[PDB]
Amino acid sequence: MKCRVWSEARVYTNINKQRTEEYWDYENTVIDWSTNTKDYEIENKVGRGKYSEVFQGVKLDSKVKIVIKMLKPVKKKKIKREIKILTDLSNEKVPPTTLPFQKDQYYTNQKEDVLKFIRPYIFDQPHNGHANIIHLFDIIKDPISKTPALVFEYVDNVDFRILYPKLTDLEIRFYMFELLKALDYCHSMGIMHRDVKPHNVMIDHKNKKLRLIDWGLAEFYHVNMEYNVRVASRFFKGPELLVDYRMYDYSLDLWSFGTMLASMIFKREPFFHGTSNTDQLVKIVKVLGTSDFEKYLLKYEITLPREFYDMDQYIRKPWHRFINDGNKHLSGNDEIIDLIDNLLRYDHQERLTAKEAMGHPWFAPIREQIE
Numbered sequence: 001m002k003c004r005v006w007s008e009a010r011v012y013t014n015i016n017k018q019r020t021e022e023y024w025d026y027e028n029t030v031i032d033w034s035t036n037t038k039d040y041e042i043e044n045k046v047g048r049g050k051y052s053e054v055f056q057g058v059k060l061d062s063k064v065k066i067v068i069k070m071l072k073p074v075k076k077k078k079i080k081r082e083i084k085i086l087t088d089l090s091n092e093k094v095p096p097t098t099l100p101f102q103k104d105q106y107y108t109n110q111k112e113d114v115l116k117f118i119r120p121y122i123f124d125q126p127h128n129g130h131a132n133i134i135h136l137f138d139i140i141k142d143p144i145s146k147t148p149a150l151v152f153e154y155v156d157n158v159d160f161r162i163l164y165p166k167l168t169d170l171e172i173r174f175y176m177f178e179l180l181k182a183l184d185y186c187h188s189m190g191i192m193h194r195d196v197k198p199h200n201v202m203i204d205h206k207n208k209k210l211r212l213i214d215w216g217l218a219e220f221y222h223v224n225m226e227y228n229v230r231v232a233s234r235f236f237k238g239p240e241l242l243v244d245y246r247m248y249d250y251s252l253d254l255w256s257f258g259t260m261l262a263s264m265i266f267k268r269e270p271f272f273h274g275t276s277n278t279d280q281l282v283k284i285v286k287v288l289g290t291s292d293f294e295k296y297l298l299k300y301e302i303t304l305p306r307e308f309y310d311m312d313q314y315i316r317k318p319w320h321r322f323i324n325d326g327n328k329h330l331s332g333n334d335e336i337i338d339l340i341d342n343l344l345r346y347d348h349q350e351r352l353t354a355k356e357a358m359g360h361p362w363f364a365p366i367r368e369q370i371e
């Protein structure tokens with residue numbers, strides 16, 4: 001019970017008050033494992049992560065090419081959670097983001113100081129963000145090896161350190177818009193991803209196809225719940241995770257989105273490159289400045305963890321300072337800088353929501369092409 005000032009999501013606050021136990025209570029599910037991998041031919045390894053080794057394969061009945069994610073040992077409820085989130089997201093008959101926009105059902109946090117963060121622009125159209133969520137096809141467990149495994153849609157993906165340097169300005173705008181649609185959708189479904197980063201964004205460039213994968217750290221948003229802060233990876237951790245503000249929400253994904261975006265635009269990878277947990281916060285404050293950092297700690301009456309007391313005073317780095325001739329083709333306009341500036345804010349309440357980000361001027365050339 002850490003938090004002094006309490007916080008609620010600006011938007012989609014009450015999804016899991018609307019939805020019941022059978023939707024969000026993953027701990028009280030029983031996983032219906034398939035006894036056999038007999039339906040699948042498992043081929044070669046195509047990727048890995050902290051929690052898995054992932055193999056390409058074929059679903060033999062249909063000949064559809066798939067991937068199989070072999071899960072490393074973890075608490076069993078983490079497995080139930082990933083499965084529940086993936087099935088909630090794929091099984092929704094009418095994705096809320098396909099329905100006509102309802103402002104009063106969107107801006108649900110009615111605190112006067114939170115309402116001031118409503119932007120003058122917003123993408124208010126129905127969209128297909130649900131189609132950017134990876135699809136789970138099966139759950140399997142080998143009887144002999146006892147390895148839990150998740151069968152997904154295959155995406156023909158190239159490592160971001162190869163692909164991203166090739167992308168044009170317009171292509172970055174396109175893909176990042178696709179990512180925002182996926183986030184708007186999972187947020188509308190009362191779910192925070194909490195591990196938004198390039199390795200978790202599959203892109204098939206020739207098919208202009210984007211999928212948001214890796215739902216193993218995702219969690220249901222419940223109003224005033226205090227969550228574990230030891231999630232995501234160091235480089236993408238929002239300030240709330242570092243200062244141990246546990247009452248966070250969907251806006252954590254928008255900090256991650258912003259840090260991913262800042263890396264692509266300024267070609268500094270990763271953008272906040274901490275050499276330790278402690279130094280991760282230092283790298284952030286070196287950029288956003290000490291002054292706003294202290295205003296933020298004051299706003300929520302946060303007592304800084306002990307490790308951060310050796311931090312020096314930093315003057316804010318204007319974003320302009322990240323522009324150079326190597327990156328100016330991506331960074332050399334006011335729109336991208338204002339976008340980044342409005343995502344990468346200490347105060348999570350201040351950050352653009354996915355829908356607000358989608359209506360930002362920087363995405364005009366993408367929005368223009370929708371109709």
Ligand SMILES: Nc1ncnc2c1ncn2[C@@H]1O[C@H](COP(=O)(O)OP(=O)(O)OP(=O)(O)O)[C@@H](O)[C@H]1O
Pocket residue numbers: 046047048049050051052053054067069134152153154155156157195199200202213214215216
């Ligand atoms: N559907 C897919 N199509 C193609 N490649 C995939 C797919 N799913 C996963 N991969 C590859 O496997 C890697 C690991 O998968 P995933 O991110 O789901 O596992 P993880 O172990 O939970 O990762 P993290 O360390 O970010 O938590 C991915 O980064 C990706 O390169």
Ligand SMILES: [Mg+2]
Pocket residue numbers: 049050199200214
């Ligand atoms: Mg991953």
Ligand SMILES: [Mg+2]
Pocket residue numbers: 011183184187250251353354355
């Ligand atoms: Mg949002």
